[PDB]
Design a protein around this nucleic acid. Structure first.
Lengths: 225, 97
RNA sequence: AGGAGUGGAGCCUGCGGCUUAAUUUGACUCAACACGGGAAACCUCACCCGGCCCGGACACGGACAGGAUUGACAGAUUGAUAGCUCUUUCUCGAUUCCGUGGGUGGUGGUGCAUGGCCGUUCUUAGUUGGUGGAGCGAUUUGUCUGGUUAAUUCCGAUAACGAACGAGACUCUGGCAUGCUAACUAGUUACGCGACCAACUUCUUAGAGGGACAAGUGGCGUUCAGCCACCCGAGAUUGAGCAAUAACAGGUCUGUGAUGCCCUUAGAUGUCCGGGGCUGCACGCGCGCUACACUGACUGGCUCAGCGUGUGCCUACCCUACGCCGGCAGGCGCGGGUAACCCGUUGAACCCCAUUCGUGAUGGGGAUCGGGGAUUGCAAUUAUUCCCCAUGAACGAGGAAUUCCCAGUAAGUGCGGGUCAUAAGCUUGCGUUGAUUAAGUCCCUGCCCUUUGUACACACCGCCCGU
């Protein structure tokens, strides 16, 4: 009936993690990006971000009602207590999860990995990203497995800025030969407001406000008609 | 396996009445979090569910210590052909649409 | 020419050497060996003196109101209130069974098929495009003579110019406020008592901020980068975290319906306080348990520390405040605390001291090993569980070989988390006492920024010559 605040916070985190994994393993094909659980007085509203929304709701909201019902009967909420929505994501091109799923479903049919990886990289760059790198490791026929990597732009690896400037996605692709793991890293651009990128700039980047052209006479003289 | 026919028909009216369910793999333990107090032994109910979802004609997916089910119409056709229960008695799950 | 503490003097484990039920999988230098968070009765024991309840979406066979299921002490079993006794013709009752595998899978193989995580090369400063120069070309310049830096850090130089990573910056953490934001869990002022015989918040807690920049001065430095010293200062290279492509057949298939199939067995690597070892002693090795004197410990004669943990999806297991009383945890009644409210201003602890060493085997620090009531864990002995009689142990700097370490290092010392049943000799953290030596070098072991040599490229563990 009651548990301590440490246990409560840990349980909330576990609930978020398991919910995220559940609707990752269900509808990875539906362009699902991530979940966000919102607190509301005596309520738990859930927002799902996906690139494709007609396919997560489906016809007559079938998929939504089914998976809402199973989340209800799973996570111990009272009868009719869970209501999740499905809204599009404003940043589809530079979300790591979405691009990882895009690559995994470009590769699941059976296709050349270089063309798909370059297409994903080009699409992320044309989405305004500051830089990307895609690593695909696994079997390419033979007695040995190789890892080929596609980079373009500029990217950071160390320090704290990598926590809020780079988003990473690691996904497994199951082929008949075996499993190849893909890794999509996107370096978000700096943008105040809009939630497209982090608010703070790179801590090693110093800005100066730029003056304008000044070609003026020696002394100001008033002019009247 | 090792499942009696009365428990078979019991689990079958359970499948008829519920349709869409969630569950967890539990066998040996004597009390259950969410599918106990059903007046039927836990082990035989869960083993009958194992038969239902692992006989070889309805697919499953095992992860995060829990079960989520898509009950195909091939299984419904098998049920209708065996027990001769028509689908004209629609499940009550078609409310709040 | 430094040292301190060492593996040898006080709390047993890991895996090989190594009688049958005993030396039991993965890991062959750093980059294995309290490592798999792996503290082995047993659910996790495959070395194990022993078994049963057994599996097939199908390829083919034996054929229906009986073709057996954990399920009886006393005639026993091979420890076992296990019907297994060559035993009843008790008992869910069509459940099932045998011969070969895909299967609902196997902590079954293969980590020389993989993913993902790590570890390491490699803790150092390294690394790479574009365009432009050079070369037929592999390739080179950029990425450098010098000075400087912890740094491919910068100054500068300059067939390179512009860039990208790594380094720095960054995040967390310590150290500082006659300042700020405020607390009925710390802290308080003369119309206050229980005492002349409702402070706009500061010690503790934690926030939008401040503070340090080689900033000031002196001296060294194509007077550049910077270095040294000194005031002032809380503080003047100040703990960690994160960390570049190519790398390795490094480890992990025994963390994961994360994952590609050659393929054993019925003695499934399922269950059931059940059950041998490994808790031996000629050591085959590795990590561990430990201070030399008025300093070591007692008078109990003054307010001490934490870092943290603590009770229902699962679930039956939480941390603890008086008395039975031998002298206290404590076998039973009792309340508080989902916690800055209770434990607790951390309930069988300093290092100190009118029990003391007069020059060191005594009082000074323990070789076993016996009783007082045992926290209550079937078992503990084939790992759980207190101090006292002073019974006298090379009783005062240690084969060959060596591991770690530069200030709140080391070392001593306890305490808390993980594992868990308050199970620690392990590990991960935390305080407390407190520090001899060194502000150096390239001698040993290695690493990096060059030049040089090479018959090496599986790259010196290479290649290679000789009847």
């Amino acid at each position: 009936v009651q548990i301590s605040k440490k246990r409560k916070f840990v349980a909330d985190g576990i609930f978020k993690a398991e919910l995220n994994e559940f609707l990752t393993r269900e509808l990875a094909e539906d362009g699902y990006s991530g979940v966000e659980v919102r607190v509301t007085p005596t309520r738990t509203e859930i927002i799902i971000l996906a690139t494709r929304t007609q396919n997560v709701l489906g016809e007559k909201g079938r998929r939504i009602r089914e998976l809402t019902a199973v989340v209800q009967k799973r996570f111990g909420f009272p009868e009719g207590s869970v209501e999740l929505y499905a809204e599009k994501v404003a940043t589809r091109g530079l979300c790591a999860i979405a691009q990882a799923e895009s690559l995994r479903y470009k590769l699941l049919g059976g296709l050349a990995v270089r063309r798909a990886c370059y297409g994903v990289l080009r699409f992320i760059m044309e989405s305004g990203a500051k830089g990307c790198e895609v690593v695909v490791s696994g079997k390419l026929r033979g007695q040995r497995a190789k890892s080929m990597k596609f980079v373009d732009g500029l990217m950071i690896h160390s320090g704290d800025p990598v926590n809020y400037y780079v988003d990473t996605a690691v996904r497994h692709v199951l082929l008949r030969q075996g499993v190849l793991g893909i890794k999509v890293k996107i370096m978000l651009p700096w943008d105040p407001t809009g939630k497209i990128g982090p608010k703070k700039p790179l801590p090693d980047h110093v800005s100066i406000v730029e003056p304008k052209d000044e070609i003026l006479p020696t002394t100001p003289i008033s002019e009247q008609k | 396996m090792l499942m009696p026919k009365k428990n078979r028909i019991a689990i079958y009216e359970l499948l008829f009445k519920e349709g869409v369910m969630v569950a967890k793999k539990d066998v040996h333990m004597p009390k259950h979090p969410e599918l106990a107090d059903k007046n039927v032994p836990n082990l035989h109910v869960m083993k009958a569910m194992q038969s239902l979802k692992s006989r070889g004609y309805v697919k499953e997916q095992f992860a995060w210590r829990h079960f989520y089910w898509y009950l195909t119409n091939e299984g419904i056709q098998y049920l209708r052909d065996y027990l001769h229960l028509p689908p004209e008695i629609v499940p009550a799950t078609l409310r709040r649409s």
